[PDB]
Write a protein that holds these residues in place. Structure first.
Motif, PDB file in Angstrom:
ATOM      1  N   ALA A  59       0.859  -1.208   0.000  1.00 38.72           N
ATOM      2  CA  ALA A  59       0.000   0.000   0.000  1.00 38.72           C
ATOM      3  C   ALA A  59       0.889   1.250   0.000  1.00 38.72           C
ATOM      4  N   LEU A  60       2.019   1.214   0.712  1.00 39.22           N
ATOM      5  CA  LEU A  60       2.873   2.414   0.932  1.00 39.22           C
ATOM      6  C   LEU A  60       3.829   2.635  -0.246  1.00 39.22           C
ATOM      7  N   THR A  61       4.210   1.576  -0.964  1.00 40.42           N
ATOM      8  CA  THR A  61       5.320   1.633  -1.951  1.00 40.42           C
ATOM      9  C   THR A  61       4.894   1.225  -3.365  1.00 40.42           C
ATOM     10  N   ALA A  62       3.776   0.525  -3.560  1.00 40.41           N
ATOM     11  CA  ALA A  62       3.374   0.052  -4.908  1.00 40.41           C
ATOM     12  C   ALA A  62       3.277   1.260  -5.848  1.00 40.41           C
ATOM     13  N   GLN A  63       3.850   1.137  -7.047  1.00 40.61           N
ATOM     14  CA  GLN A  63       3.680   2.074  -8.186  1.00 40.61           C
ATOM     15  C   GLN A  63       2.826   1.353  -9.225  1.00 40.61           C
ATOM     16  N   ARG A  64       1.860   2.042  -9.823  1.00 37.01           N
ATOM     17  CA  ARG A  64       0.957   1.448 -10.838  1.00 37.01           C
ATOM     18  C   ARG A  64       0.949   2.371 -12.058  1.00 37.01           C
ATOM     19  N   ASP A  65       1.518   1.895 -13.164  1.00 35.37           N
ATOM     20  CA  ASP A  65       1.383   2.552 -14.489  1.00 35.37           C
ATOM     21  C   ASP A  65      -0.120   2.750 -14.737  1.00 35.37           C
ATOM     22  N   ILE A  66      -0.499   3.877 -15.352  1.00 33.62           N
ATOM     23  CA  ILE A  66      -1.903   4.154 -15.771  1.00 33.62           C
ATOM     24  C   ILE A  66      -2.071   3.612 -17.198  1.00 33.62           C
ATOM     25  N   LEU A  67      -2.560   2.375 -17.304  1.00 34.53           N
ATOM     26  CA  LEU A  67      -2.628   1.612 -18.578  1.00 34.53           C
ATOM     27  C   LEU A  67      -3.972   1.906 -19.250  1.00 34.53           C
ATOM     28  N   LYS A  68      -3.970   1.938 -20.576  1.00 32.70           N
ATOM     29  CA  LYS A  68      -5.190   1.818 -21.408  1.00 32.70           C
ATOM     30  C   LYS A  68      -5.370   0.323 -21.668  1.00 32.70           C
ATOM     31  N   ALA A  69      -6.559  -0.088 -22.116  1.00 29.70           N
ATOM     32  CA  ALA A  69      -6.810  -1.456 -22.610  1.00 29.70           C
ATOM     33  C   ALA A  69      -5.836  -1.755 -23.748  1.00 29.70           C
ATOM     34  N   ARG A  70      -5.280  -2.955 -23.724  1.00 30.23           N
ATOM     35  CA  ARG A  70      -4.453  -3.490 -24.822  1.00 30.23           C
ATOM     36  C   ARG A  70      -4.995  -4.873 -25.127  1.00 30.23           C
ATOM     37  N   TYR A  71      -5.017  -5.236 -26.391  1.00 34.32           N
ATOM     38  CA  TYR A  71      -5.636  -6.494 -26.853  1.00 34.32           C
ATOM     39  C   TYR A  71      -4.552  -7.398 -27.445  1.00 34.32           C
TER      40      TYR A  71
END
Ligand SMILES: Nc1ncnc2c1ncn2[C@@H]1O[C@H](COP(=O)(O)O)[C@@H](O)[C@H]1O
Ligand SMILES: Nc1ncnc2c1ncn2[C@@H]1O[C@H](COP(=O)(O)O)[C@@H](O)[C@H]1O
Ligand SMILES: [Mg+2]
Ligand SMILES: [Mg+2]
Ligand SMILES: [Mg+2]
Ligand SMILES: [Mg+2]
Ligand SMILES: [Zn+2]
Ligand SMILES: [Zn+2]
Lengths: 433, 432
Positions: free
Chosen positions: B405-417
Motif C-alpha cells: 500500500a505504501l510503496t506500490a507504483q501502478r502505471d496508468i494503462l489503457k486497454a491493450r488487446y
C-alpha cells in the motif's frame, strides 16, 4: 457573441483563411514560449524565433523533453496563475507534467465540447474516466459545466464507483450522454446484461456515447453503437498535455481542430514536417499561457488528409494508427479487432486478447457455450482469408477474462473506524477502501 | 451571501437567518417531497412557522431517490452526487452553479487561507461523492493550483502522492485524518521525513471522521507542527463547520440554521448534546428543512478565544457510542486519546480494537525496538483511565497497513488487446 476571443467552426471559408487565423497568433505564442526555462535555455546565445516566418525553423519538442523538464521546466507564467496540474497516463516512473490557467481551461473545454451531437443543459452526462492526475475526467466535467449539462462524476478505476453502480445510475437517472474509453463501453454493456438489462432497449434516454483514448476501428465503433441500440459513438483524439486535438463529424471521421493548433506530420527518417500524410502527430497549440509547446511530437502514428469530407467542415481529417511480424505478415490490434468485431452481434463476443509469438498468433475470447465453437471457426476462417498467419484460437467461458464480480460487485463507500463491536468485521479498520 | 464580520451579536446572526426563511420555505415547497408533506394543509411561509417544521430524516432522502427532493428543472442542475456509506440505499444530492458558489465559499473558510500561491493536493474521492469536487471548486474560487490526487483510485497510489507532495512543493492537502497518517507512512517508505522533508507544506485540511484534539495534535507533530485544519460536512449539506485558530470547529450559522435533536423527546434546541439538524439557507436545487444528519454532536454557545461570533461543535458520530466491557464503558473517542498519548517517538499511528462483553482486544503497529515498551505503556494508560480488562498486541509495521500500500507504483494503462510474446497479457481487458 461579438467579443468571443477564440475562433469557432464557420470563421473561415477556405484553407488560406484558416492559415491566416493560425499565422496571426504565432508572434504571441513564440513570445510566450520564450518565457519558459526550456525555450529560454534552447535559444540561449542565438536570436529566438519571433515571427510567423521564423516558425518554419523551430525544432521539434519531444516527449522526452517534457519528461526531462519535470515538473515545471515548461512553465511560462507564475505558479499563482495556474488553475490545475496534471500528469499523463503510461509509465509512473517517468511522469509527463502539464498545467493550465483558467483561460487555458476555456480553450480546453470549448475543444472537448465540439461534439456534433451537441451538449445541452437538458443532458445528464456520466463522466466515466479517471480524475486521478490525468485530465480526462476534469476535461469532460469542464465541457459539461461550459454547456450546462448535469454532470454525474462516475470517475473510473475507483473503488467508489463499480460497474454495478454505474449501470444503476445510467438507468435510474435517465443518463443521456456518457464519456468513457471504448473498452468501458463494452464493460458497461456486460454489467447491464449481468443486472438483467438489455443495452439495446432498456436505456431509451441514452442518446450518445463519447469516447477516446484507444485506437478504434470503424468495425468496433459500429458494434459498440449496435450494442447500445444504434446510438452515435462520438470519438475524439487528445492527450493530457495537448487537450482534444480532433473530434468526430457526423460522417464518422475525426477532424483536426486546426483553428486552435498548428498540426504537422513528422517523418523521423526525413526529419521533415508537412501539413498532411502519414507520420508522427506534431502540435503547436495557439491558445495556452501556462505551458507553451512549439511543435510537440505526441509520437502517435497518424494519417492526416486534406480531402474534403461529406460533413462540409473545412478541416483536415486524421486516422490514429496507434503509437508485430508473424513470418511476413504484420499484425496490428486494428486488423485483429476488425475480424473479432465482424463476428455476428448475437455471438456476444466483446472481450478478447492475442499474443504475437514469432511462429503463431495465440488468441482467446469469451463467448457463451452455445456459440463458442461457431465463433472460433468463423474467426479462424477470417484470419486465414485476411492475414494468413498460423493461429491457436481458444474460446473461453464468460467470467474468465472479465470476472462476474467486476460486473456485479457492490462496494459500500466506508470511512476509517478504529473501535468495533464483537459482531463486526474489523478487517476494514485502517484499510477501509 | 454573508461572510464573517457581517453580524456583531447572536441576535444579528438570528436576523440574518430569519430573513432567508421565507425564500427557503417557498423553494422547499417546489419539491415533490415537501409539496406531498404539506398537501391539503397551508404550508409554512414565515420565520415563525419554521418552529413547527417537521424533521427530514436520512430515510426520507433514500425513499425519494433519485429526484424526489428536486425543486428546480433538471436543466438548472450543474452536478449530481451520492453520499458515502451503504451502496444498497443511495442518498442522491444535486446542485445548481449558484448552489456551488455557496458550497465553495463554505469550504474556503480555512483560517490558514487558500491563496493563488498555494499548490493544493486534493486527496479525497471524485467518484459520485462531493468531497474531491468541493475542495477543487474552493481551490478554483481562491486561485490555488489544484493537483487532483483523487483517492480510492488505481491511478494515484500513496507512493505517487508522496512524490507529488515533495517535487511540486505542495503547500496544502485535503484528505481524511487516516490518509494523513497513510501519507506519513508512505513518505518514510519513499525515504522522506514527514517532520522535515516537506518545508513548503504549510497546512493540512481534514474531515470525514471523528477526530480528538489528542490525535489532531499528533498528526500536526508527525508533519513538523503545521496546522491540521478540520471541517465537518456531508455530500448532501456541504461544509457546515470549520476550525478557528484556537482549534475548535464553528458552525457556519450564516449559511444554515443548526439545531440539536434529542431523539427520545423529539425536541430541537439551539445547543447541547444530540443529533445534528441542518436547514441550509442558500440552495435552490435540493431544499432541506431540518435535515437530521443523525451525527452525535455537542454544540456550545460559550464564546471562543478566536472571537468568531458562532457556536462551536464537537462531532462524536459513531465514535461517541459507549461499548460496555466488563465494568467500564469505552468510546472510540476515549481509546483514541490514550493511543495518541503514547510518545511520538514510538510512531504508533495504525491501530484497531474490538469491544467484547468481557475484554477490549486492541492491536497496533510499532517499529521493533519500541514495540514492547509501547504495549506496556498503553496497558498502564488503559488501567489508569478506563479500568477495562484488555488484550493488547503490538504488531510489526506492514501487518495492518501492508508495505505494498505504501510503496506500490501502478502505471496508468489503457486497454491493450495484442501483446508481444514476452508481455503479461493478464492486463488485456482488466487494465485498471
Ligand atoms: N481517438 C484516439 N484514437 C487512438 N489513440 C488515441 C485516441 N485518443 C487518444 N489516443 C492515444 O492516447 C494518448 C493520450 O494519452 P493521455 O495523455 O493519458 O490521454 C494519445 O497520444 C494516443 O496515443
Ligand atoms: N469533522 C468530522 N468529524 C466527525 N465526523 C465527520 C466529520 N466530517 C464528516 N464526518 C462524518 O462524515 C459524514 C459525511 O459523509 P460524506 O457524505 O461521505 O462526506 C458526516 O455525517 C459524519 O458522520
Ligand atoms: Mg495558482
Ligand atoms: Mg499522453
Ligand atoms: Mg443541467
Ligand atoms: Mg452523508
Ligand atoms: Zn467530416
Ligand atoms: Zn473559536
Amino acid at each position: 457573441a461579438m467579443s468571443r476571443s477564440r475562433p469557432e467552426l464557420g470563421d473561415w471559408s477556405s484553407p488560406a483563411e484558416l492559415a491566416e487565423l493560425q499565422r496571426s497568433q504565432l508572434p504571441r505564442v513564440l513570445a510566450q514560449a520564450l518565457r519558459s526555462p526550456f525555450y529560454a535555455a534552447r535559444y540561449r546565445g542565438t536570436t529566438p524565433p519571433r515571427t510567423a516566418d521564423d516558425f518554419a525553423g523551430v525544432e521539434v519538442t519531444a516527449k522526452q523533453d517534457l519528461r526531462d523538464q519535470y515538473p515545471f521546466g515548461m512553465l511560462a507564467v507564475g505558479r499563482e496563475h495556474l488553475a490545475t496540474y496534471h500528469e499523463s497516463s503510461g509509465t509512473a516512473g517517468e511522469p509527463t507534467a502539464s498545467y493550465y490557467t483558467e483561460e487555458d481551461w476555456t480553450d480546453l473545454a470549448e475543444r472537448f465540447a465540439r461534439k456534433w451531437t451537441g451538449i445541452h443543459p437538458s443532458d445528464t452526462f456520466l463522466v466515466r474516466t479517471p480524475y486521478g492526475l490525468v485530465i480526462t475526467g476534469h476535461l469532460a466535467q469542464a465541457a459539461g459545466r461550459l454547456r450546462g449539462a448535469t454532470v454525474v462524476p462516475g470517475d473510473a478505476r475507483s473503488l467508489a464507483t463499480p460497474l454495478s453502480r454505474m449501470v444503476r445510475v445510467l438507468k435510474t437517472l435517465d443518463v443521456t450522454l456518457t464519456w468513457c474509453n471504448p473498452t468501458e463501453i463494452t464493460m458497461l454493456a456486460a454489467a447491464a446484461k449481468a443486472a438483467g438489462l438489455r443495452p439495446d432497449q432498456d436505456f431509451p434516454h441514452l442518446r450518445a456515447m463519447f469516447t477516446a483514448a484507444e485506437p478504434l476501428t470503424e468495425v468496433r465503433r459500429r458494434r459498440l453503437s449496435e450494442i447500445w441500440g444504434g446510438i452515435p459513438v462520438v470519438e475524439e483524439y487528445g492527450s493530457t498535455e495537448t487537450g482534444t486535438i480532433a473530434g468526430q463529424c457526423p460522417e464518422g471521421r475525426m477532424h483536426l481542430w486546426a483553428d486552435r493548433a498548428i498540426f504537422e506530420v513528422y517523418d523521423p527518417r526525413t526529419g521533415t514536417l508537412s501539413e498532411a500524410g502519414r507520420g508522427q502527430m506534431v502540435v503547436t497549440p495557439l491558445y495556452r499561457d501556462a505551458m507553451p509547446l512549439l511543435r510537440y511530437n505526441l509520437a502517435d502514428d497518424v494519417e492526416v488528409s486534406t480531402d474534403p469530407c461529406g460533413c462540409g467542415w473545412l478541416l483536415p481529417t486524421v486516422t490514429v494508427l496507434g503509437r508485430h511480424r508473424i513470418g511476413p505478415a504484420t499484425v496490428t490490434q486494428q486488423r485483429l479487432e476488425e475480424l473479432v468485431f465482424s463476428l455476428p452481434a448475437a455471438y456476444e463476443v466483446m472481450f478478447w486478447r492475442a499474443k504475437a509469438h514469432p511462429d503463431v498468433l495465440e488468441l482467446e475470447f469469451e463467448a457463451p457455450e452455445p456459440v463458442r465453437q461457431r465463433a472460433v471457426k468463423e474467426l479462424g476462417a477470417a484470419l486465414d482469408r485476411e492475414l494468413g498467419v498460423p493461429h491457436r484460437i481458444t474460446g473461453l467461458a464468460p467470467g474468465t477474462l472479465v470476472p462476474a464480480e467486476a460486473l456485479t460487485a457492490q462496494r459500500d463507500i466506508l470511512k476509517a473506524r478504529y473501535l468495533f463491536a464483537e459482531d463486526e468485521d474489523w478487517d476494514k479498520a485502517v484499510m477501509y477502501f
